[PDB]
Amino acid sequence: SMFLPPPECPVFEPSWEEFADPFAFIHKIRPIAEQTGICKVRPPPDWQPPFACDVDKLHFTPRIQRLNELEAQTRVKRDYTLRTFGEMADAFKSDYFNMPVHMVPTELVEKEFWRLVSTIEEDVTVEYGADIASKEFGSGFPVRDIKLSPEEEEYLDSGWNLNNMPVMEQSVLAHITADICGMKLPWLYVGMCFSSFCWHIEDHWSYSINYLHWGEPKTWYGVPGYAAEQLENVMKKLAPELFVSQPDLLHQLVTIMNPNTLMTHEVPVYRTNQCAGEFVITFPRAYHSGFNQGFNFAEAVNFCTVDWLPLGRQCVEHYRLLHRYCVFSHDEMICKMASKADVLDVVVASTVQKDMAIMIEDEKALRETVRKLGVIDSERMDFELLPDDERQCVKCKTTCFMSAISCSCKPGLLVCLHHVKELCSCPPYKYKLRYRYTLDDLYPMMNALKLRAE
Numbered sequence: 001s002m003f004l005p006p007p008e009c010p011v012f013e014p015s016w017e018e019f020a021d022p023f024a025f026i027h028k029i030r031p032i033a034e035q036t037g038i039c040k041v042r043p044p045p046d047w048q049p050p051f052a053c054d055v056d057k058l059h060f061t062p063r064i065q066r067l068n069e070l071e072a073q074t075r076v077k078r079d080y081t082l083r084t085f086g087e088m089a090d091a092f093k094s095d096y097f098n099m100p101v102h103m104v105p106t107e108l109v110e111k112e113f114w115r116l117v118s119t120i121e122e123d124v125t126v127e128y129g130a131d132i133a134s135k136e137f138g139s140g141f142p143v144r145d146i147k148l149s150p151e152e153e154e155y156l157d158s159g160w161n162l163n164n165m166p167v168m169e170q171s172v173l174a175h176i177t178a179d180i181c182g183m184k185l186p187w188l189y190v191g192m193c194f195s196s197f198c199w200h201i202e203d204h205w206s207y208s209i210n211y212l213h214w215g216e217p218k219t220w221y222g223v224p225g226y227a228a229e230q231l232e233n234v235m236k237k238l239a240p241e242l243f244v245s246q247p248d249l250l251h252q253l254v255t256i257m258n259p260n261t262l263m264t265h266e267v268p269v270y271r272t273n274q275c276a277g278e279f280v281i282t283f284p285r286a287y288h289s290g291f292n293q294g295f296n297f298a299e300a301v302n303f304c305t306v307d308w309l310p311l312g313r314q315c316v317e318h319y320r321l322l323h324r325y326c327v328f329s330h331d332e333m334i335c336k337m338a339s340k341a342d343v344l345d346v347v348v349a350s351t352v353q354k355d356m357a358i359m360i361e362d363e364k365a366l367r368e369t370v371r372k373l374g375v376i377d378s379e380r381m382d383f384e385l386l387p388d389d390e391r392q393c394v395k396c397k398t399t400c401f402m403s404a405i406s407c408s409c410k411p412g413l414l415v416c417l418h419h420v421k422e423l424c425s426c427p428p429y430k431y432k433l434r435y436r437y438t439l440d441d442l443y444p445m446m447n448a449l450k451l452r453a454e
């Protein structure tokens, strides 16, 4: 009546053989899990990585969260150690319910969270150590440096050690060297009761893998990729403030919204309580949100497989339509992988080859189009050398790589080939096509992938 819990998302309990290879396992579950957006994976009972960080020596400054439904919050933002944060978090939850922490039922915390965010008259604020870079704070998983124990060493090379997943051969980012805003490095989340993550999808519609190392559960809500635009239409009607365009990547607006509201508008929503030692996997373009039941410690990483690759291209097209900034150039990634065709995994090579064929035919059509507009002059340009802010389309903000148009009248400015008319006031003969590759350069790059693929 007040809150109706969404149905449970799928839970998988792989055997050790199934678990050994995460890419194979994630591909196998895709038919089921992509219908729910999120799923939970319980590792085999003996897979128990030991936790390595320290409670007194690592510091962080958490974000302050006002728990108000539909209120705009920025997606990324007093000093605490893990010890002092834990003391604050435990006292908060204990005092809130006047109970011991392990006695507060998860169902009650969930009901209370949704009551609390709905009520104007409540002004409950909490703190969340969110989006902490593993660079500075260190990973919860073992990494090669401190002398590691034999127990720690068993997990250095695990496929489910989140440090390794981005650099394994079946990762399409394995041979990519640009630093990509942390898409290959894990991020940490130090939670307390009611600290929350707003509704969002991942950069470039990537997967995410999320591991709860220890503490009280993390409650999730998830929506399948197929329903993403449904959800966005519901949210735009109820909170249009969130859909006004932002000046950069760091100004993304997000919010808390009751999943019953989505369910009332026929958006499918699934839930789970993720406990210590369990993974949650989010699928491409799968909206998710949630909150922590109490003091806890989680680690997550973006993840990009051969299954994701075609969706990556659709994402950048969607970003262009919305005038939203890219984290990296998808075409640049594809061309980097083509330049390493000889060392790619053969299934990766085959998949890149297919995406490259689409890229080449689209580029051919765009170049024919701008030529018909009277852009005659051209010059090769190594787009990859330019900082991102020097190669964004004036109009749609896409990061250019394959080609762009420049104008001697407006020095430094570029547009992508969809927006030739938006660059400058001057006639078309004053423009120049700047291109990374000739069409004749591209066909052999694609053939190398084909040879590798066999």
Ligand SMILES: CCN(/C=C/N(C)C)C(=O)CNCc1cc(C(=O)O)ccn1
Pocket: 076, 130, 131, 181, 182, 187, 189, 196, 197, 202, 208, 210, 218, 288, 298, 300, 301, 302
């Ligand atoms: C892969 C980690 N990541 C990238 C970090 N930022 C770009 C800094 C994310 O944005 C993950 N998405 C936010 C989020 C946070 C939580 C959480 O607070 O536990 C759960 C699910 N998703």
Ligand SMILES: [Mn+2]
Pocket: 200, 201, 202, 208, 282, 288
């Ligand atoms: Mn996320």
Ligand code: NI
Pocket: none
């Ligand atoms: Ni437009």
Ligand SMILES: [Zn+2]
Pocket: 393, 394, 395, 396, 397, 398, 415, 416, 417, 418, 419
């Ligand atoms: Zn453009």
